[PDB]
Symmetry: D2
């Protein structure tokens, strides 16, 4: 199989990039960063973020792997002392792959991103929430956050959103300081949506701050923002059982 | 073919009681093996009807008229005789299995809640055989997807579309203070995940399953999981959950 | 004049007489009838039912609280030795609970006060200075003193208030908040002379709780909270940094 | 209310732009601007209302307010609130009450609300609502990351007269601070200081806070 490695960029990660590279040169594994069927990030979820987004249009046949140098996070499954084991288990092609859902933002011709964590909207902020073409509330406040299961441990969590197991195929909207009065009556609860439900947020300025994962692009004169579970998923090469609730224990308790 | 009807028993469900029985007079009644169980009175009625025919859940398609589970207005009660009259495809909602050890098994359609008597409520939460937290507070609520709009909402949970096969635990008035630190956040578990509540000091709790809230001495494990069974709804129109979320909580402009 | 109260355990009984061994000198005498200093041994729960012994001699008694391993007690066991010597005044507010039927009972409270059902739905109406404010269907209501905000009030989502501040704090418990029973959701801090009143609508329910004592009442006509004219007095030797003891109890 | 402007100051003493009365237009929003005398309002929580007014034109009644202090030191008064947030990346700040550390807050930011300012933003961040007369101030948290590292108090915090919360940086040195509606960034802030000002605001009165709250939210 072909492969490529990204680095956090500190000397110890680059140092393990090159060692892993020379580790792989002995097996039937070639190095490719334009068409890799295996992608490695060194340095944690924030860097894992960039790898994911560096190969969005070949997400379909890439098998991601992550190494994190300190604590574990939620995307890295691996310690750098354990690279040596990884290099030979990967060569042997001894890995099962796992699908996590993604969240498609649509802007309105139109723009259209992917999101492994979340996606937010700000910029006096007043937007009409429309679920499956049927109005649901009129929201005044800071913003809204649509987040993926994998994203529920992140800004989701800090907004009162629930922690979801990544395998569940869903999205979840949470408010950001909703005023919630007579005029602008909002649910308060977070809203956990399934595949094929579309939430469309529609204006009442039209120039919002729209951040996909971390990239915030300010958009101009927006006629609609539309969120939904994406048909594309993301695949992790896995060698051992993952324990989501453990890592939630570990990060927070 | 066959059918029956639960009634709240109030003086509104009771005109419609036989007014639908006599209505069906030209298209017969079972109270023991019906193919249909029709609820008249509200959501708590529907539940008692669920807990009365939970045994036969495999061949039943439930339906309900209100005077989140009733999709029918009393003025349409005869266009419902006409719609059942011919014969719809069912849509199904997951349920929450509940095991008690000392082994007593129960399904719920909304929630299951654990509290203690007097004496503080402290219980070890254990997920997939592994310790996750030691929680102190008023109690803990595990809700089904349909149940999220119920108690779970007032607790601080998310609302979930009932197609999603999951369950949801939420915290009741937890103490967080360097002795006891809880997640706080609500937690959505998929199928095949097992959340088990194991006792600490006091070992006699109050365990509710939907509306039937019973007391238990002797307890040494309480074990939530999502069931392999489901409840089926009979529908001729059909349903927009968020539409109903919007009606109960935001506005009902008509 | 002095007194002490004890927890019941060996350790608490241990030092009660030791301090009365140090007090038998000096110009001070014991009478658990007319004391003006009352000393808790054993923590904050034990402090609570001591107070509840001397309510009618409140505005006249000092309280110091002795402690094992807290928000009311400001001394540990080792430190009893010098305490005897220089015992040889600060206020925190209270909250009167009034119930009506068919005659009225009343209860001062140092932490909070909670309403519940006796079985079914708790469905109540919140009338504030005789002007309806919301209708509540949930589990119950909590109204806390400031000195009680670190208690059950903290868990329900209430604000932490410094105790000098003269207020009360209504918080909800699992309100349905739908379009029928719409609630503010937020905590609400009522000041002196504001009367908050809990009328029922259907069933005449109510398992009430004051601090820790949960007494049933059947057919209650009406319930009323308001900031206390009486006040509880603490004998103090140092300066108090409530915010530091909030750090300790809750942040690691 | 350009139309209601000189409308009935034609109906009426005098007028000059050191007033003894400043009347507010069309609601709470730009009463905040008029903010920076007995004040009164008519709205198209602060404007308790026009002919019968100058007809009646009074008791003056007290609402408290908030001092901000950034460090020459500049200071900013507040009718509603004051907030600190980071310019780009991780907002990380240390909370020092009464000259003694309390917690290290990481996330979006923090919000010091006045008693009258509790029905505003503070409400939406989870603050309590206080009848303004209560001599106090309140801090509420914005979107904390509460884990192993940055353990925070969670609850909103209410402080009285003379108590001082001081917010101090840990990594980067600028934050977008702002008070009431203005939005004035600051680089090179080493301390941010919230304390009830000795100040007071007087209202010209001829309320039922709990009913205005009722009418706005219920």
């Amino acid at each position: 199989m072909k492969y490529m490695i990204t680095s956090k960029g500190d000397e110890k990660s680059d140092l393990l990039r090159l060692n892993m590279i020379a580790g792989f040169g002995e097996y039937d594994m070639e190095y490719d960063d334009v068409e890799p069927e295996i992608v490695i990030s060194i340095g944690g979820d924030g860097t894992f973020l960039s790898a994911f987004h560096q190969y969005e249009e070949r997400l379909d046949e890439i098998a991601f792997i992550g190494i994190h140098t300190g604590h574990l996070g939620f995307y890295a499954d691996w310690r750098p002392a354990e690279a040596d084991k990884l290099v030979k288990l990967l060569a042997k092609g001894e890995y099962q792959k796992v699908s996590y859902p993604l969240l498609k933002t649509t802007v309105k011709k139109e723009a259209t991103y992917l999101a492994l964590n979340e996606s937010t909207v700000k910029s006096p902020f007043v937007v009409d929430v429309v679920i499956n073409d049927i109005h649901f509330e009129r929201f005044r406040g800071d913003g809204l956050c649509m987040s993926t299961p994998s994203g529920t441990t992140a800004y989701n969590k800090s907004l009162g959103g629930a922690l979801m197991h990544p395998s569940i195929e869903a999205m979840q909207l949470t408010e950001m300081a909703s005023i919630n009065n007579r005029v602008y009556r909002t649910i308060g609860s977070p809203l956990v949506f399934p595949k094929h439900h579309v939430v469309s947020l529609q204006p009442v300025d039209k120039d919002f701050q729209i951040s996909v994962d971390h990239l915030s692009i300010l958009h101009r004169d927006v006629q609609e923002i539309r969120y939904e579970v994406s048909a594309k998923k993301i695949h992790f090469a896995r060698f051992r059982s993952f324990d989501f609730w453990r890592r939630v224990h570990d990060s927070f308790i």
